[model samples]
Target chain A: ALPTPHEIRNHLDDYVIGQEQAKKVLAVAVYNHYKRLRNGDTLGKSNILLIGPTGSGKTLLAETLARLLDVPFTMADATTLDVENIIQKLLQKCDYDVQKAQRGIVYIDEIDKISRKVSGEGVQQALLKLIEGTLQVDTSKILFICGGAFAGLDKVISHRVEEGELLAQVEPEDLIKFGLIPEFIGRLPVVATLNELSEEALIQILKEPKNALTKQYQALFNLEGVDLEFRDEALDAIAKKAMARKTGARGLRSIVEAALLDTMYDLPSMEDVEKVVIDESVIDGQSEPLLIY
Target chain B: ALPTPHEIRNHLDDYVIGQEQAKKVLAVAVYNHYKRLRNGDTLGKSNILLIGPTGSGKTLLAETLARLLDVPFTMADATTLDVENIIQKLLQKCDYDVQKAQRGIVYIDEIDKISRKVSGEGVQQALLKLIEGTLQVDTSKILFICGGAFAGLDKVISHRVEEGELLAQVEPEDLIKFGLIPEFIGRLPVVATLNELSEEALIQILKEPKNALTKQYQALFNLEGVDLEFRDEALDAIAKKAMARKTGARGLRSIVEAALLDTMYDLPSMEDVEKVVIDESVIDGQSEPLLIY
Candidate 1:
């Protein structure tokens, strides 16, 4: 009863910290498309497209979307191009009720690869027919969310616009030049682009969400009767390193994990050590975490 | 420059423990086939086939063969059947010399899937002509080794023989009924089968070789001035577990790694613990190791 566009973005805020504008756009597309299934509207389906850099929360957003909704959801890659197999997979997420299975959500990742830059247009020819609905899967009721990094798309967009406005106002026509056909782009009418998170945004990610990295690690440490703390500068160093690697949010966990390997082992064993503090020097590998007796 | 067959098998003994009979057969087939390339004989190539259970040291034999005679060795999977891509890969292992690329060894794994049991028989048609030699790779000089588990092949073999002779004499005809074409069997003339290692044989794997599990762990612990030893019962317990898993020799490393994980971490830190002895109880998760101060 409460499937409002603004309400969904507010719901997204509890788990995710950054991507404010992208969240709003994606939230509305989901809300509007989902509402069309009810209340006498003769509108065509609004299949979606998400463009982002690596670990920019493209799949995570889709994953979160699945979590917040109680419907059957299935994910597939674009390579096989075996149309009936995907329907069979979608059927697996639900039961023998063919009607319910047809109405489920499908997210096919690596959608950009089907544009024929790597191989023949024959792959794309078979995929376009069933997205609207097929004989086996009346996919018209189904929600299809297609995701891709669309790397080097800047090359195509910049040619159409000035060099100064590289990432500004990327139109669907640009994707056409990037090798995807015009009719193929029409199916995924709702387009959303996610930006690489800023260093400040990455810092915000540590403490703001329910499953924040800082809270989770602190939970682990508290079980051993020890308090674990990260100095402000320690987090800053991690965000800066993540930015430099261009790995975005995903690499933060990997960088912190290796730095804390000895700390995780040593602190749990020492009965008297009540608190452990990590600083900037610890992240850069110059020093170990400071301990309190 | 004469890398003789018997000499190669003798070299194999230092690294590998079981499969002695398999080593002999493979060595002679390799020797005879390789010898034909020299001495100007009119004999055709002898491509080889290896049938074995999982972790039965199929690839290890090929790996050791590469070590004994240093040449270009490249491994590929059968599903792609991308003929030119493999030749291009072999060319990369050597220099710009196409003749050396043509003469190098090529091993295609999971070769049994091409049988009609999995899919259409169409895949075998293109592959048959090339084992003799093709336009891109004049593979008559090259050695081809095809490998598979060929699971449940006992059904075909048992029917051909009696119940008393289940695994008795698995002939080329048994493979034909298993869905491989007759011509496909003809290409891989020299057939070799590997059996699942016994518990005694698995324990032999621990100490008999240069890279045995016990020796390698001892090497790591020795660097830290800690003597690591596994009791007789502990070794026996690990072998029994691996046999139950049906994973054979390959699973020994995985089982040992997990059992030693905490020991590896703990003993390295404590200064007074000079030696760590693992008993059957430690492997079974019932007790800790006995530390000698």
Candidate 2:
């Protein structure tokens, strides 16, 4: 049974936080693509293009969706693709199985790499036919998802907006002006822009996910027969520091790693220490690990 | 004779296209530091901190100044440095000669890497005494310059500003709020913010630099006994495309490389193609290379 858009989004929310608009857009886009497949209506293929800052869950969103749908998804970095041989390689990745290929998702990460050229004939032009779903093989079943950090996309939007106006949303025209050809933009009709993760969202990401950093550390400590207690203030300090790093949820991992590195290295060897309490002092350089037997 | 600040700026102009404010600040700072050194007035040390987007010439500015001054300069990536070992490494790089070290420049690239940690005790705190010129070794003679892409710094500023206000300047307090401690920020008194490269600046960069992409390509073709003529429109097209890529001057190299890959490969084999005219069509994918013997 095909899950509803809400169910797909619920799955994504478990892993990625605060990209409400992106989750909804992705949920509906994937659901509609599958619905169209069930109905035998494959006239118009709607691929998705995601734009966001680095570590903002663009790739994670697509990966989580594929997991929810239980579909075969192939991910490729667009930098390695060339104009002459991309179609051949992509077809091969689909294993020459036309029917299976039609039902799969092909995600091209770093689409901005080709768009970096001053000429229109780089990877952007090369992938035109492929992205347009006009390849020799049956592409109607394959959904193409493209993602890019789009480093300077804000400048393009700022040019169009009035002075002192905040760039609240990305318009398709902005991407067009930013060097993507109109034809390529036309094929990927659904464009979802992910927001930079906020401090609250990042804290939730660290605590809520099944693979949360705290849980991973807890499991590691449990193996050592030691209990790991992360105090509320410690979590707040961690979140604040992660926010300062500006790498979104990705920054959270490094902070956790740095805070735990000393404990992880020494705790296992010490049989007397049965519990480790991480406090704000550890984060602020005021105190070392507070240990208990 | 020490070159005047004007002369130092003129040299910088030859390499970096924009950022008039940054160039001026760097020019005056370098001149004053040298002037102070000559007079033996070393009561306090004033270091420089360059805050800007990636590829905005933060490191380039310091490099250009060091070049103009003809002083020994060492560049270090901040990621590998730890609190305990950085002083030893920095001293080693200075070659254990305090006199020579005092006369040199120490540039810390990606200073933001250390600043990225949520914890107060990460690399930023570790370097406090070092950057503050209070290390055991004499840093009074050495001028420390730090640079970072500071990816989400604008967001930090935006949150503090009123709605619809453009982020025109970065106050020292802004850096403090962004993660650097007050003492660290206090030491680097001169904070020069670099502007994002404008399209016009990018075009100028492609054509005007001594090591410009056009010059490099011309040299490559010259090696093959071919004269490469880049029409004005072709340069314009290239700049427009590069601007869309949003990578500042770094994008120029890749764009030029992508556009010339086929010609560079095929033309060397065709001995008769003595002269190649690169125009808008080549950039737009409308025409092949126009060859003339």
Candidate 3:
């Protein structure tokens, strides 16, 4: 038995900070994919094709979803990458539960990046039928989720527009335009895409997510007997930096870490300092970290 | 001779940052108003009604417009305030040139704030014909720009929306709905409304405007022999701070001032200090303003 889409999405919200629509789409799509697999009647399986820029939460989401499903999840750079070895690798994660491995989820990253360079035999296509039926691990029940830059367009569900434009879900034939084999597109029946987060969303990511950058820093500092606090302006500053850099949440972390580096580096010996404060000036390079002694 | 609406708008952009649609609307409406008044043919003089939150550039824009038109401009808190004294105040800015006073610009703050408190006589409608005809100078030519919260809403031109929805420009009758006199709404012929800016626009406001908050700080710091700089992350932090506080550019100044206060307070006597830097941490209270000695 699998969780309902609502339950899965509610759980996802606890970990995912931005990409609201993207999470919802994946939750519903994955829920149906597993529900049908359990029933063993629907010949149709819509492997998800998630498209987004780097630093978007494609990998993070898949990993999170896998934990929820309690199924084995593995990530490989490309679907066509080193065919059999990858499957062998995934099977081992299930610890010889070959039946369990059959239902595993594979996060296949960037077909375009791998295909353009490999120029190899259809090792890419070779996995096609292996997935269509079963080579060793009942590949029929396995799920493939791909994510990367593939013109990042749509079946055309657009919403909440402001400065820029957004299109609907991905269109499959467009994959052919990108020189993707039509059969490759067939494997991915449902599409979910992520866009650059809003500055506000990016800001929330810094503090709202379960393991947010601020939370991470706070916990780390607390371990050193220091209470770490970020002013509201500080979070806003982090989000602003991320949006401008187009780095997403990861960028938010990089910048936060960068801002805290010098403070964190020297704080261990400063046992007198019971609290540390972060503000806009510290992030902007105008000031030194505030150590509350 | 009056400048074309295009010329006026281009000039406005040089000084006023953001509020694109609002500026464009004003340029055309004001251009048409002056052009008609100059010709002395049209009896219809629809004054302007601009609606927006505080610190949203209403005062700054109107001041800039007055400067560009090279006409005397005076600001009064409310249209119903000290009725004759306010006009006399405007008259003095014109140097007793009654004609110039008649053609001057009047920036009225808010009606709702003033109306709710005064509870006075028809003095609320006192300026009705004062600009319709003339008490002394030519009121017909003097443009009255009334701005503030009157339920920021539409003659209904809407554009480029995101997180929140926006309606078209302000509707005159809605003023009546708010208990404003229909005749009071009648004096205002055109309406232009301002929205809470995008975070990016707010960031730009901190640095892009001719007298932006950043530029102001830089100039001040330079006078004390210190080169002041704000990292990109820092400006973002300031905007984020501003947006979160719902404090417009003015709040931007307040926070920037608070962050730099210690630096500015002690800087004048420090002859060895050569440069100053500001960052996200400083604004967020995470760090101290940096000083280069």
Candidate 4:
């Protein structure tokens, strides 16, 4: 039985923070994709296109849903494949089970790399066949999700803004001008744009997920028989610094790792050390870690 | 004739604003590489590795060096290639002139994506042959420059820091632990790390280069029969906001575009508008653009 869109979205919330719009779109898309598969609907699949800055959870969203749905998922870089091998490699994901492969999800990341600027029309021509259900494989049951940082896409969007009109959200036509072929854009009917992660959202990323950075650090400390705790202020300071680096959630891990380096290296050797507390001062570099025996 | 290292560094300085250490390392490597080629020295090619945060000019350095040296260069995402096609595509850079391809530059960006956590040993095994100069093509003259944001590599570097010792600079062994097989690391002996761009560096990026963001905006305005001027405070504000987004130099373009979008759209239609000056207030959204006829 296929899960409802709301149920799928609820599962996505556990792994990805914010980007409600993207989550909603993905949820409905997944629901429709699988429902169509279960009921053998002949309606065309509405493959999704995800646009966001790197580390904003675009890939994570696709992977997480695939996990919840227990479907075979394959991720391929768009720059790497041409028309000849894309179907072959995608088929490998389902262990050559043609029927299962058609029902699985294919995530093509860095899709912007295939923009006319880099590889030219060849890749797009190939993708057009895949996305438009013109390929040899039965793609009607397959849901394709494409994502890219699309670094210079803002220019295309800005150029289309008319006087006195607020900057319009990016449209398929804008992506077309940005180098994606019209046929390719037409097939990806559901386009979801994700906002840059905010400071609050980044902090949540550090602490909220089951495999959050804080929890990972805690597990390391536990191995050495020491308890590790991060104060709320410490988390705020870390998030602020990571935000300053402008690398998205990717920056958070580096900041946290640097902050805990000295302690993680030294504490394991000290038998009397029972716990370590990270405070704002530690993140600010004004004081050493707060130690407990 | 190959340029001297000093001359090469001078050329690099024009386009890349900072990372003097990285520039110096690249300069020496380039000098030695071509010097060896000129003398037919049998020494193995000295490949380079650049590690840094995104938008910190790793790819720019490689491309700029290739331009200065007048050599064919190909940049490929490391994640996009496998053992079979990596060399085939690299050779295409020289139009299959094996001799010229041997002397060309191959830059593998996002090399860290091949980390064990992602694709496992397959990509690494494939890259090992290319980087180790054991490929079917004569790689002895090919200078391989591999780079990556390597986001969590800081954790691996941090863990290796000894108790009471300051965090040591990253070493080849750290990257080996990060995922590259030992043989691959041995071939790319000259490793240089780039610093995260500072707010001041980001401001310099906007105005210093011939194609800087300010100049680009000014050119756009020039097409509209209006002159555009950016005050120092406005540049500072733009840099600060981009820094706040924590996306390094990549954030600057979007910030500047958003700030100028309204003026760029509205002013072009007004006959009385002759000049537009962007001040800090415009960036802060507190006031409209100051115009002069």
Find the candidate with the highest TM-score and give its number.
Answer: 4
**Model 4: which residue pairs collide?**
A245-B246, A246-B246, A246-B247, A247-B246
In candidate 1 chain B, where is summed lDDT lowest over 10 consecutive residues? Answer: B260-269
**Candidate 3 per-residue C-alpha lDDT over A155-238 given as tens digits, one digit per residue, 9 for 90 to 100:** 222222221134352456555555567777787787777776667887677777787767766766665578887888878877
Quote each prediction's TM-score. Answer: 0.51, 0.48, 0.46, 0.52
Candidate 4: tens digits of C-alpha lDDT, residues A102-129: 8878888778867885345777777767
In order, candidate lDDTs are 0.69, 0.69, 0.67, 0.73
* Model no. 1, DockQ: 0.01
Across A34-112, the per-residue lDDT of candidate 2 in tens digits comes to 7657666612355788887778888888878877877666677877764424445555765766666567787888886
User: Candidate 1 residues A1-293, lDDT tens each?
Assistant: 63555666777887776776667666756764565565323343557788877666777777677667666788888765656677787787787568677557788788877776523344553455556553244667778888887876878887776622354356566777787855466566666677766679898887677787888887888888878788888888888878888878888888877777788877757876455555645456768787787
Q: Candidates ranked by lDDT, best first?
A: 4, 1, 2, 3
Native contacts kept, each candidate = 0.00, 0.00, 0.00, 0.00
DockQ of 3: 0.01
* Model 3 per-residue lDDT at B110: 75
- lDDT by residue (B1-293, candidate 3, tens digit) is 67866777789997877677678767866765565556554123546777776667788889999999998899887644555576888888888888778778888887555443224324444555455543344566788888776543322223212211343522333444455654455566556667766788887887887888788888988787778888788888788887778776667778887888777787877875555455645556767766566
Q: Which wins on TM-score, candidate 1 or candidate 2?
A: 1
- For model 2, the superposed segments whose C-alpha errors exceed 4 Å read A1-293, B42-44, B82-98, B116-120, B134-137, B155-168, B272-274
TM-score, second chain, candidate 1: 0.88
lDDT of 3: 0.67
lDDT of 2 at A167: 31
